[PDB]
């Protein structure tokens, strides 16, 4: 899928997307989601 193998994607039921990077070990509401559409 359009997800990079280094990236980890989940969306919260609140309607917010947070990608956890196993690289840096951080969660990202700062998403390729809003960065796209």
């Amino acid at each position: 899928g359009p997800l990079p193998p280094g990236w980890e994607i989940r969306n919260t039921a609140t309607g917010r997307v947070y990608f956890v990077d196993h690289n840096n070990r951080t969660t990202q509401f700062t998403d390729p989601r809003l960065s796209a559409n």
Binding site: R10, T12, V20, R25, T26, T27, F29, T30
Partner: peptide, 15 residues
């Protein structure tokens, strides 16, 4: 993050 404080870093956070 410009959005509200996100889920604590668990690999697969259940929400």
């Amino acid at each position: 993050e410009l959005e509200s404080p996100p889920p604590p870093y668990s690999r697969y956070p259940m929400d």
